[PDB]
Amino acid sequence: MWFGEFGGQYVPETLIEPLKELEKAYKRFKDDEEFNRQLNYYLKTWAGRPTPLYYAKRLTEKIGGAKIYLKREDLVHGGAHKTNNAIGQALLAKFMGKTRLIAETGAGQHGVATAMAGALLGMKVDIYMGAEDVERQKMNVFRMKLLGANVIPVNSGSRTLKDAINEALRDWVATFEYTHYLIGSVVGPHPYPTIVRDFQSVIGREAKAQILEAEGQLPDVIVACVGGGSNAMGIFYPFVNDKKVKLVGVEAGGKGLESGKHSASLNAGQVGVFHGMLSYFLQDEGQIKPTHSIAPGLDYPGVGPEHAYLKKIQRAEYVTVTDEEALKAFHELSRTEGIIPALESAHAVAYAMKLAKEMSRDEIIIVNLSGRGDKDLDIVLKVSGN
Amino acid sequence: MWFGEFGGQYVPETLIEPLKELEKAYKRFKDDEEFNRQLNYYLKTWAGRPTPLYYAKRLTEKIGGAKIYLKREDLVHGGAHKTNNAIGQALLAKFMGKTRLIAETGAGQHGVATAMAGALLGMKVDIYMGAEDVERQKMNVFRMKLLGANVIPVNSGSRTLKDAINEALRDWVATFEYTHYLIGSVVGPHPYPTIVRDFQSVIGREAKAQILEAEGQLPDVIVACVGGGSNAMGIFYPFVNDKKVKLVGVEAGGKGLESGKHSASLNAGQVGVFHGMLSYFLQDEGQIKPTHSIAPGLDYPGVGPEHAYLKKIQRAEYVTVTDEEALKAFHELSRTEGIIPALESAHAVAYAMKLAKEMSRDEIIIVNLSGRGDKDLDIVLKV
Numbered sequence: 156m157w158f159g160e161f162g163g164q165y166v167p168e169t170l171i172e173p174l175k176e177l178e179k180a181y182k183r184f185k186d187d188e189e190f191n192r193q194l195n196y197y198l199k200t201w202a203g204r205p206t207p208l209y210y211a212k213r214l215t216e217k218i219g220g221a222k223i224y225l226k227r228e229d230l231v232h233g234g235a236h237k238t239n240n241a242i243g244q245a246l247l248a249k250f251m252g253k254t255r256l257i258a259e260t261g262a263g264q265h266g267v268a269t270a271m272a273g274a275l276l277g278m279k280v281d282i283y284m285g286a287e288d289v290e291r292q293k294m295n296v297f298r299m300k301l302l303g304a305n306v307i308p309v310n311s312g313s314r315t316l317k318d319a320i321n322e323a324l325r326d327w328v329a330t331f332e333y334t335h336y337l338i339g340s341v342v343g344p345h346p347y348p349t350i351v352r353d354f355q356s357v358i359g360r361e362a363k364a365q366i367l368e369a370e371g372q373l374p375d376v377i378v379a380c381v382g383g384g385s386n387a388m389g390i391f392y393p394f395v396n397d398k399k400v401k402l403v404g405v406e407a408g409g410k411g412l413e414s415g416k417h418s419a420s421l422n423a424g425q426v427g428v429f430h431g432m433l434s435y436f437l438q439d440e441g442q443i444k445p446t447h448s449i450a451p452g453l454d455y456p457g458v459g460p461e462h463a464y465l466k467k468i469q470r471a472e473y474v475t476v477t478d479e480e481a482l483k484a485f486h487e488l489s490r491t492e493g494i495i496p497a498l499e500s501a502h503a504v505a506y507a508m509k510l511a512k513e514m515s516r517d518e519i520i521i522v523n524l525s526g527r528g529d530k531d532l533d534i535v536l537k538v539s540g541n
Numbered sequence: 542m543w544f545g546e547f548g549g550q551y552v553p554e555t556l557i558e559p560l561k562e563l564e565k566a567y568k569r570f571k572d573d574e575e576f577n578r579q580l581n582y583y584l585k586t587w588a589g590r591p592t593p594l595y596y597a598k599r600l601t602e603k604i605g606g607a608k609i610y611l612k613r614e615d616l617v618h619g620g621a622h623k624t625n626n627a628i629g630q631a632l633l634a635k636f637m638g639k640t641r642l643i644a645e646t647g648a649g650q651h652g653v654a655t656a657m658a659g660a661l662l663g664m665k666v667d668i669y670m671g672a673e674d675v676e677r678q679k680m681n682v683f684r685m686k687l688l689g690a691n692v693i694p695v696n697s698g699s700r701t702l703k704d705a706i707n708e709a710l711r712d713w714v715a716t717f718e719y720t721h722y723l724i725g726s727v728v729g730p731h732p733y734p735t736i737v738r739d740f741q742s743v744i745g746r747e748a749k750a751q752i753l754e755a756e757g758q759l760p761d762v763i764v765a766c767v768g769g770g771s772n773a774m775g776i777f778y779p780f781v782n783d784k785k786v787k788l789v790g791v792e793a794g795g796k797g798l799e800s801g802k803h804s805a806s807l808n809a810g811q812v813g814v815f816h817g818m819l820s821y822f823l824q825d826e827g828q829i830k831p832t833h834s835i836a837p838g839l840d841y842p843g844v845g846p847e848h849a850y851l852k853k854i855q856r857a858e859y860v861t862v863t864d865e866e867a868l869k870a871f872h873e874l875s876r877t878e879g880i881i882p883a884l885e886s887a888h889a890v891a892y893a894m895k896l897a898k899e900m901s902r903d904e905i906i907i908v909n910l911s912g913r914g915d916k917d918l919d920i921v922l923k924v
């Protein structure tokens with residue numbers, strides 16, 4: 156439930172029952188033979204795992220520093236690592252006898268992944284989405300609709316991701332007997348930060364074997380972008396006990412840290428309690444403060460408790476990258492390696508490039524390439540221009 | 542060079558030298574140990590091969606007949622099978638000492654695949670694209686520029702794919718010393734229909750191994766959509782000598798075969814020489830007729846000569862599906878399996894659905910799901 160001081164279950168008593176039931180089911184199924192057979196089979200045949208680990212030789216040579224490898228989560232079905240979590244939890248839901256999935260989304264990407272897994276497993280899917288986000292993510296909303304899901308605009312509060320999570324929890328209180336709340340990152344009340352991390356850990360287990368195969372040793376650094384923290388947790392977690400492996404999380408610096416238009420909770424936020432967890436949040440009077448990133452998956456005012464924990468014990472370092480740096484990295488990866496990254500992933504690429512220049516040519520960086528940039532084309536067209 | 546009577550090399554003198562140099566380079570490198578190390582490496586670590594073979598359980602049970610498996614070329618880097626050919630020909634070009642790629646595109650999908658492969662290997666890339674297609678494919682155009690390619694609008698003729706291929710050929714004649722012309726499907730003069738089919742055959746080889754693992758037998762039917770024919774040849778070719786495996790190719794029926802708006806060359810075209818090859822072409826006083834499909838990859842007025850051959854010897858059957866049926870299958874796959882298919886691929890899905898209803902529950906159909914539908918979201922929305 157806790158990662159040091161961070162985590163917990165700060166919810167009304169009406170959620171205690173659904174959360175206890177989910178904990179019990181997960182403890183039962185997580186190591187179950189049949190559950191893991193089916194999950195692996197879907198991950199393989201439907202999602203396309205394993206993803207490759209790709210040596211970005213041109214990019215490495217251009218920078219003239221450490222070797223840069225990309226863990227190619229951009230190749231998973233759906234175009235992002237979120238699918239690994241959507242399948243794991245949807246399958247758990249199905250083993251729990253649930254017939255409906257609900258989920259929040261802000262960028263839309265989780266909503267799509269949820270819709271895809273619910274279509275796969277024959278479940279009803281309802282997606283809560285703040286109205287400001289719906290307006291800004293018309294194509295992802297359309298994807299969710301083609302996939303058979305219903306999108307429910309949330310008009311309360313600030314009409315964004317924080318408010319969609321709050322509305323989804325209210326729904327789950329009334330519907331948990333047949334509904335599973337499929338949370339999209341390593342956030343929320345226990346057992347969600349644990350479960351989502353466990354479903355994303357496949358990324359690091361694969362990357363560890365692949366890098367051993369490619370280079371005969373562990374990497375010197377692993378770099379991942381941090382919104383809520385699930386792609387980073389998925390790649391970090393199997394290297395947590397390999398003490399020589401540096402772990403770097405990259406937050407959204409937005410228009411700059413001193414601009415106030417960023418989303419860097421670990422860098423600039425303060426301890427707080429929302430959405431059932433004690434973690435770092437960006438807040439003013441204890442209110443959640445508006446956040447921004449050019450990468451819409453990075454725009455959440457909190458961060459997962461397990462990251463707060465790794466930061467506190469100094470197991471992992473957390474840095475920031477601006478919108479402009481990320482954008483430059485997005486263009487550079489496209490032109491240099493023929494890989495169009497998600498703007499989220501482009502944050503991690505931008506930090507890696509900086510980092511590589513300072514290291515020696517026999518050192519190794521693995522970047523988690525959390526998604527592909529098709530979803531971002533409209534935004535990049537508007538901001539970069541034609 | 543020929544498939545039965547089809548194919549060939551019917552080009553001006555000025556194209557002979559480039560084609561014969563390509564053909565020698567191909568002979569040299571196709572089985573070369575280093576060339577195949579490099580190919581396999583890029584296909585694995587950059588493209589993501591192998592792609593999985595997926596049992597479409599919900600769809601199969603709903604229809605109630607044959608089991609439907611999908612060969613998931615939607616999961617290749619770039620979201621379509623074109624990447625296999627783009628890699629293989631770009632790498633060839635690189636081994637030949639070329640520094641530049643040119644390529645035609647209509648739908649923009651080949652233009653993107655070529656741009657990606659050029660970027661990967663550090664080549665210059667110029668894409669020839671009919672002005673008509675440029676205006677309908679804003680996002681693919683954008684993709685190509687992000688990948689560092691240049692897009693050259695073509696304003697001659699009808700300003701569509703056939704004209705792009707013409708201009709690319711004219712450029713290649715001038716530039717082949719340092720440029721490779723990376724053609725997009727199993728069409729053109731020898732050795733292109735062979736080279737493209739050889740670089741797609743990986744699809745069939747994987748699918749063969751994968752269906753044996755899954756079901757312990759070969760399939761009853763393999764179904765693929767057919768524009769120029771490359772995804773279909775890639776999946777068919779390794780099964781050509783397995784005499785019990787039926788091969789079905791699905792052409793764009795457009796607004797109906799009666800309607801004048803379709804791209805069903807094998808089904809309603811006539812044999813003719815165009816783009817250096819004898820094959821089936823849709824023709825009016827003998828000029829190449831305008832063509833149409835909702836799936837922009839299926840709108841070439843010709844078809845690859847290896848298909849013309851397979852049809853003639855009756856080793857494969859060719860059918861058509863309309864725009865309407867393809868769009869219904871696009872929606873059905875999305876809702877039932879959580880896979881949004883390319884509108885090209887949705888033609889094969891739509892036919893496999895029809896076929897499956899008529900077949901037994903222990904029979905097996907493999908559909909080549911040649912692409913994902915992200916690229917098609919604008920046009921499906923705009924509808």
Ligand SMILES: N[C@@H](Cc1c[nH]c2ccccc12)C(=O)O
Pocket residue numbers: 259260261262263264265266316338339340342382383384451452453454455
């Ligand atoms: N907004 C993103 C990522 C996301 C989903 N749920 C979250 C919860 C916390 C932080 C980020 C997220 C999306 O919906 O695709």
Ligand SMILES: N[C@@H](Cc1c[nH]c2ccccc12)C(=O)O
Pocket residue numbers: 645646647648649650651652702724725726728768769770837838839841
């Ligand atoms: N027009 C499609 C497919 C294509 C490329 N070249 C071709 C030649 C023949 C037939 C089809 C094609 C594209 O460009 O992506």
Ligand code: NA
Pocket residue numbers: 381382383418419420421453454455456457458
């Ligand atoms: Na944050």
Ligand code: NA
Pocket residue numbers: 768769804805806807839840841842843844
């Ligand atoms: Na045709």
